[PDB]
Amino acid sequence: SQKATNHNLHITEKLEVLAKAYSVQGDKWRAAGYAKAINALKSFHKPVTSYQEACSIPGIGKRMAEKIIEILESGHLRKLDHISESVPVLELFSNIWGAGTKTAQMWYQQGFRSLEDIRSQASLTTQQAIGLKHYSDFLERMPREEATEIEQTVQKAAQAFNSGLLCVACGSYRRGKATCGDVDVLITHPDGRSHRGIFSRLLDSLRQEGFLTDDLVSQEENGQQQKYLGVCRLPGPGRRHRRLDIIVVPYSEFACALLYFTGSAAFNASMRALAKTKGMSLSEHALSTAVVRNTHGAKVGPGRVLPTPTEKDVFRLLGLPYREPAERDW
DNA sequence: CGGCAAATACTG
DNA sequence: CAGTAT
DNA sequence: GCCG
Numbered sequence: 001s002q003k004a005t006n007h008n009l010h011i012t013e014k015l016e017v018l019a020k021a022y023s024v025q026g027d028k029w030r031a032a033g034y035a036k037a038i039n040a041l042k043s044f045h046k047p048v049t050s051y052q053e054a055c056s057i058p059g060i061g062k063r064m065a066e067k068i069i070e071i072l073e074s075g076h077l078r079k080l081d082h083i084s085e086s087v088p089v090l091e092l093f094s095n096i097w098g099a100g101t102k103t104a105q106m107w108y109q110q111g112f113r114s115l116e117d118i119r120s121q122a123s124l125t126t127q128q129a130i131g132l133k134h135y136s137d138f139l140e141r142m143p144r145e146e147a148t149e150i151e152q153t154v155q156k157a158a159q160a161f162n163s164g165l166l167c168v169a170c171g172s173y174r175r176g177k178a179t180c181g182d183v184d185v186l187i188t189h190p191d192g193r194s195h196r197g198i199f200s201r202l203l204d205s206l207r208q209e210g211f212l213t214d215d216l217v218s219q220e221e222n223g224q225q226q227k228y229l230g231v232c233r234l235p236g237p238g239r240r241h242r243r244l245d246i247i248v249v250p251y252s253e254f255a256c257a258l259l260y261f262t263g264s265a266a267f268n269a270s271m272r273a274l275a276k277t278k279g280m281s282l283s284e285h286a287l288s289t290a291v292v293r294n295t296h297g298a299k300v301g302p303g304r305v306l307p308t309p310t311e312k313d314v315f316r317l318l319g320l321p322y323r324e325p326a327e328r329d330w
Numbered sequence: 331c332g333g334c335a336a337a338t339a340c341t342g
Numbered sequence: 343c344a345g346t347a348t
Numbered sequence: 349g350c351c352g
């Protein structure tokens with residue numbers, strides 16, 4: 001399935017252009033449609049060669065096929081030459097951290113057209129300014145090698161003040177990709193408690209040696225802190241700034257946090273959607289049953305948290321065959 | 331046609 | 343609450 | 349966008 005080579009790269013390459021286009025424009029679902037088809041093509045055991053062949057792949061309809069036939073026969077899609085040249089800018093703006101569809105739309109509607117304009121005439125949030133300062137660096141993905149060296153840093157720094165702590169790099173890393181956009185580290189402790197309030201001793205230790213360089217999201221006042229979104233950079237010459245993502249969780253939620261943080265996103269939403277049909281609910285906390293809702297139908301009480309010691313148990317209960325991380329791209 | 335790829339955590 | 347982010 |  002997934003872990004195979006894209007036999008239809010030339011096809012998806014272009015469709016991918018539309019997907020992103022419709023996305024920034026706000027057409028969420030239409031873009032979602034393409035996304036699905038694209039993934040379908042990617043995982044196809046062989047390369048598509050005919051119009052009919054495309055129509056046989058679930059997720060591909062006439063319209064989509066019509067575009068496939070054009071590319072397979074002319075090597076070029078016409079729809080691409082007719083995209084508001086306003087999209088490039090939007091795509092450019094939304095690529096800023098903390099900047100999304102709305103924000104990117106706002107700036108454009110205000111005259112801005114280049115990162116130079118925004119870099120001097122736009123109203124930026126502490127987050128956005130950081131995303132802009134490291135714009136070029138956040139565009140590049142890192143080698144599984146570098147990613148690994150980052151996890152180790154966070155881990156050794158954690159086990160530095162408690163060897164019991166367990167650190168695991170999830171996300172694209174755990175799915176075994178060759179490159180990672182960022183490093184998603186999950187931290188917990190077997191004694192189901194030694195994890196409580198440790199961000200301070202961790203974040204400080206990182207800042208101390210200079211590892212961490214920026215902070216995007218981190219409520220360091222409260223002790224109920226859960227996630228951390230910042231920027232780091234390993235020692236040495238020619239080092240780029242990488243996006244870090246760390247979360248601390250109770251050893252009693254490990255199985256559900258690992259599933260979540262491992263993703264992928266599409267995979268999560270999909271799986272979570274399924275649970276919703278079995279009268280359950282999935283999250284990084286646990287897999288529960290239907291919540292208590294009074295006459296009105298208002299959630300008045302939590303559902304019964306089912307026992308999920310490992311990931312496998314989550315699937316079993318959901319009535320699905322366990323899928324390796326690598327096979328969870330979508 | 332309308333639903334579809336969710337549940338949750340931070341920031342003004 | 344709206345927007346952005348996992 | 350595709351699908352029930």
Ligand SMILES: Cc1cn([C@H]2CC[C@@H](COP(=O)(O)OP(=O)(O)OP(=O)(O)O)O2)c(=O)[nH]c1=O
Pocket residue numbers: 170171172173179180181182183184260261262263264265266268269348
């Ligand atoms: C954005 C997002 C993410 N997730 C989960 C599931 C994956 C992890 C890691 O996220 P990331 O985007 O780094 O993904 P990753 O797969 O690591 O890819 P990169 O290499 O970082 O791009 O977070 C989710 O459930 N819903 C979302 O909307």
Ligand SMILES: [Mg+2]
Pocket residue numbers: 171172173180181182183184
């Ligand atoms: Mg990641």
